[PDB]
Design a protein around this nucleic acid. Structure first.
Ligand SMILES: [Mg+2]
Ligand SMILES: [Mg+2]
Ligand SMILES: [Mg+2]
Ligand SMILES: [Mg+2]
Ligand SMILES: [Mg+2]
Ligand SMILES: [Mg+2]
Ligand SMILES: [Mg+2]
Ligand SMILES: [Mg+2]
Ligand SMILES: [Mg+2]
Ligand SMILES: [Mg+2]
Ligand SMILES: [Mg+2]
Ligand SMILES: [Mg+2]
Ligand SMILES: [Mg+2]
Ligand SMILES: [Mg+2]
Ligand SMILES: [Mg+2]
Ligand SMILES: [Mg+2]
Ligand SMILES: [Mg+2]
Ligand SMILES: [Mg+2]
Ligand SMILES: [Mg+2]
Ligand SMILES: [Mg+2]
Ligand SMILES: [Mg+2]
Ligand SMILES: [Mg+2]
Ligand SMILES: [Mg+2]
Ligand SMILES: [Mg+2]
Ligand SMILES: [Mg+2]
Ligand SMILES: [Mg+2]
Ligand SMILES: [Mg+2]
Ligand SMILES: [Mg+2]
Ligand SMILES: [Mg+2]
Ligand SMILES: [Mg+2]
Ligand SMILES: [Mg+2]
Ligand SMILES: [Mg+2]
Ligand SMILES: [Mg+2]
Ligand SMILES: [Mg+2]
Ligand SMILES: [Mg+2]
Ligand SMILES: [Mg+2]
Ligand SMILES: [Mg+2]
Ligand SMILES: [Mg+2]
Ligand SMILES: [Mg+2]
Ligand SMILES: [Mg+2]
Ligand SMILES: [Mg+2]
Ligand SMILES: [Mg+2]
Ligand SMILES: [Mg+2]
Ligand SMILES: [Mg+2]
Ligand SMILES: [Mg+2]
Ligand SMILES: [Mg+2]
Ligand SMILES: [Mg+2]
Ligand SMILES: [Mg+2]
Ligand SMILES: [Mg+2]
Ligand SMILES: [Mg+2]
Ligand SMILES: [Mg+2]
Lengths: 59, 71, 134, 95, 22
RNA sequence: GUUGCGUGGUUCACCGCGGAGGUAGAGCUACUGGAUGGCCGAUGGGUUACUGACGUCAGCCAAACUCCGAAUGCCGUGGUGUAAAGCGUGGCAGUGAGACGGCGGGGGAUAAGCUCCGUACGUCGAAAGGGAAACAGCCCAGAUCGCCGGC
RNA sequence: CCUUGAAAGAGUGCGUAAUAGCUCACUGGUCAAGUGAUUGUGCGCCGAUAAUGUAGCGGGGCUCAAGCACACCGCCGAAGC
RNA sequence: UGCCUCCUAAAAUGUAACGGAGGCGCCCAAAGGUUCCCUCAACCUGGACGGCAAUCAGGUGGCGAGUGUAAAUGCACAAG
RNA sequence: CUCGAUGUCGGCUCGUCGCAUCCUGGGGCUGGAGCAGGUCCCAAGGGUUGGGCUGUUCGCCCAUUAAAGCGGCACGCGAGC
RNA sequence: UUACGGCGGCCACAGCGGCAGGGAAACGCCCGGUCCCAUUCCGAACCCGGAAGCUAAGCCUGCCAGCGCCGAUGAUACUGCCCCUCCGGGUGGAAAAGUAGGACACCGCCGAACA
């Protein structure tokens, strides 16, 4: 159950928790993508940075 | 108008579940807003220090909020 | 309309946000005036509206004023620079939120009652409508 | 007498209530002697018309989507501004 | 009066998103 | 802030668990005060149509009211993640006149391109490029260099 | 307040200082299809009102929309990728 | 202009103004320590002076009294 | 904003603009018989005096006139007085 | 084990109040102030020696929603973060009050009669 997260909006103007959640997820720049195991922590991060990312269930 | 006094930095210093050493101050307060429990002294100005090493525990003792140390 | 006593002569301005949660329906009379906007209604405005209703009906009926101006507002002297102590109280004001019923009226004639309530509404610094007791 | 076409609320909450009110229904609950509450959806216009015609204490022979059981209105929540019904409290009655 | 009003009114635009300096 | 030498994940983020609260709201026959309309009627008035106490019946209000009471934020802890987090000790600093915008407040007349606070809030300062006609502080976005490529 | 009851006021509004006159509140049949009140709403009208020169779309121009709402389809667009 | 208490102060701490309210520059040889004991205010009824309210008796009363002194937090398990 | 200088009242001279109109022009209503008015609407083409007192602006007054308007322009204008 | 006397846990869903039933052991009421001890006066209280009488009280058992107490679900207020020019919306939390209801406690140790 892996999720594919892609950064869509920029980090400029983002708040501290949002920037740090993006860093924890591992996204560097816009249009960058990572694959993460779906669980409670991952969904918490995605919830915090929902407006800056788009998430689709890629395998 | 215009006068004031210094802020006294009152309140809880160690919270529930925290590991403390003997003598650690736990609650600075005026009067007994909290009450000493097992292994907890009071102090000359209601200071609620720890008499033993352990973990903090807040409770109820028939109306009084109490702070106790479990070893 | 002035309180006999207050515990604090100088108070912060009442906060003008949200919808009124209490006194939103007619309780005493069968006709009422319901506010639709926030304002600081003063005792002078209240007296004006009350006299308007009374002097239009001219006889019969009962009028209730379910608001009291017990919040004071201060004002500094006219010719003074900025910031040399808070000013002395000048006005007495009631904090009104949308949905709050201001006046209550009962009268045998619906047309005359509605005309008097409209006359009252046109004296207040708010948009207000007329609601019945269903 | 006062027949009502109600359905069980699939989802409850702030957003669900807002969506139902926008769609034109009235969220409600049904409790009483059975010590068990149910969340039902009441169509707005017909329920309001029933309330106007037959009064507040009118017996409501509403039937669940599959079952029939009459009840009574215990309390209604009316918006101060819109003066419409947001919520209904229906109490079962043992005749 | 008019200068301030007209300068303040133009922050209501799609690009500025409802805010502007001063 | 930078840099030398130590320490090495101790920092921070999310999830779970253990904790203190009295703000928003709300309530008040739960206190202290204010306050609308009745019933009853304490006193005072010349047998009382006049003041109408206390309660009680309904409806209310409060920064210095609270029987209550969030959301957030804060402390600790167990996991997961994350190079240029953190901590100690030395060398060398600069800064200590900030501005505007969003939200919460005080002063002011709830006026000021006014003034004073808060805000792991933003930008400018010290940030070029695209948008807003022009337009430090608004929206998008952080320029290693080259290209007569694409989205 | 009642009464020839076809129908109907010690008066609905201008109007005599007063008495009159004036219409109207109401009915008979002539014609024959909708007529009024009121609620919430979308977009519009007035209130509107300073001084060098149009001067409150950036301009030309635009309702045969190049305006507004909803739905949909392409593309342009930065030193971002 | 130093110190103490509350609100502003936005439910940890801290937080400005020539913002809103008050206090302190002491007092007690017991108003300190310890041991033991007790529960107040208010209201009702009855009772020479004595009455709204002096001391007495009986009920009701869980904190609405009291705390050396401002306010806050506490104290009826009493810190009274 | 201007402190390594932005000359401050009144007057003279020269103006220019607005209309919230003083006269002249056109109207509605009138508690407009006529003459004269009042109030409101349209209208900025032109015109809108000379003296006494005061540093004055302002103001009072004298004699006229169809009229003796109200304001902005660094309270227009001192490298023009 | 039944139902009694203590000691505790907990501090109202357990309290207050009303209505009934009990004195085997016990617990109390009760008899006097000679002894210890005491009354800011009083053997009222405390303390001392006892059982002449008794469940009338305390106490125990059962029944009462009466006052008081606990209290949902749903909805709403409020709110973190986004969208948004305000209006409002999305998403995640979520009251107080009120309603349905609950409730005249529950749990452990020792001792006596009974076991
Ligand atoms: Mg303080
Ligand atoms: Mg001391
Ligand atoms: Mg309320
Ligand atoms: Mg009005
Ligand atoms: Mg909490
Ligand atoms: Mg407080
Ligand atoms: Mg509040
Ligand atoms: Mg109260
Ligand atoms: Mg409060
Ligand atoms: Mg805080
Ligand atoms: Mg260093
Ligand atoms: Mg300094
Ligand atoms: Mg400074
Ligand atoms: Mg602000
Ligand atoms: Mg401010
Ligand atoms: Mg400023
Ligand atoms: Mg700020
Ligand atoms: Mg600088
Ligand atoms: Mg730039
Ligand atoms: Mg920066
Ligand atoms: Mg730019
Ligand atoms: Mg393209
Ligand atoms: Mg315009
Ligand atoms: Mg690049
Ligand atoms: Mg504070
Ligand atoms: Mg604080
Ligand atoms: Mg002093
Ligand atoms: Mg003492
Ligand atoms: Mg002593
Ligand atoms: Mg004592
Ligand atoms: Mg200068
Ligand atoms: Mg100089
Ligand atoms: Mg120069
Ligand atoms: Mg001129
Ligand atoms: Mg004109
Ligand atoms: Mg005439
Ligand atoms: Mg005329
Ligand atoms: Mg002209
Ligand atoms: Mg011409
Ligand atoms: Mg000049
Ligand atoms: Mg000169
Ligand atoms: Mg010059
Ligand atoms: Mg000059
Ligand atoms: Mg010059
Ligand atoms: Mg026996
Ligand atoms: Mg005796
Ligand atoms: Mg007994
Ligand atoms: Mg008995
Ligand atoms: Mg709930
Ligand atoms: Mg509740
Ligand atoms: Mg009970």
């Amino acid at each position: 159950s892996q999720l594919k997260i892609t950064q869509v909006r920029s980090t400029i103007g983002a708040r501290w928790k949002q920037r740090e959640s993006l860093r924890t997820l591992g996204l560097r720049r816009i249009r960058h993508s990572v694959i993460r195991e779906d669980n409670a922590a991952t969904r918490g991060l995605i919830a915090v940075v929902r407006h800056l990312v788009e998430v689709e269930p890629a395998q | 108008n215009g006068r004031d006094s210094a802020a006294q930095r009152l309140g809880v210093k160690r919270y529930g579940g925290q590991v403390v050493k003997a003598g650690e101050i736990l609650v600075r307060q005026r009067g007994t807003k909290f009450h000493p429990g097992v292994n907890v002294g009071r102090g000359g100005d209601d200071t609620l220090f720890a008499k033993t090493a352990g973990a903090v525990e807040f409770g109820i003792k028939r109306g009084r909020k109490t702070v106790s140390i479990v070893g | 309309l002035i309180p006999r006593k207050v515990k604090h002569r100088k108070q912060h301005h009442p906060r003008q946000r949200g919808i009124a949660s209490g006194g939103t329906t007619v309780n005493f009379g069968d006709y009422g005036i319901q506010a639709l906007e926030h304002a600081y209604v003063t005792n002078r405005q209240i007296e004006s509206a009350r006299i308007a209703i009374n002097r239009h009906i001219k006889r019969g009926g009962k009028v209730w004023i379910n608001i009291f101006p017990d919040r004071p507002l201060t004002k500094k002297p006219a010719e003074t620079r900025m910031g040399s102590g808070k000013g002395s109280p000048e006005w007495w004001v009631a904090n009104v939120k949308p949905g709050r019923v201001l006046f209550e009226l009962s009268y045998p004639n619906e047309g005359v009652a509605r005309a008097a309530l409209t006359r009252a509404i046109h004296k207040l610094p708010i948009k207000a409508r007329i609601i019945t007791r269903e | 007498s006062n027949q009502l076409r109600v359905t069980v609320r699939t989802e409850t909450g702030k957003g669900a209530s807002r969506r139902a009110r926008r769609a034109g229904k009235i969220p409600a609950v049904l409790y009483g002697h059975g010590a068990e509450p149910q969340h039902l959806e009441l169509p707005g216009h017909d329920y309001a018309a029933v309330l106007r015609h037959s009064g507040t204490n009118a017996v409501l022979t509403l039937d669940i989507a599959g079952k029939e059981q009459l009840a009574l209105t215990k309390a209604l929540h009316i918006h101060p501004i819109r003066r419409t019904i947001q919520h209904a409290d229906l109490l079962v009655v043992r005749r | 009066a008019k200068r301030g009003r007209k300068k303040r009114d133009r922050k209501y635009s799609k690009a500025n998103h409802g805010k502007r300096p001063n």
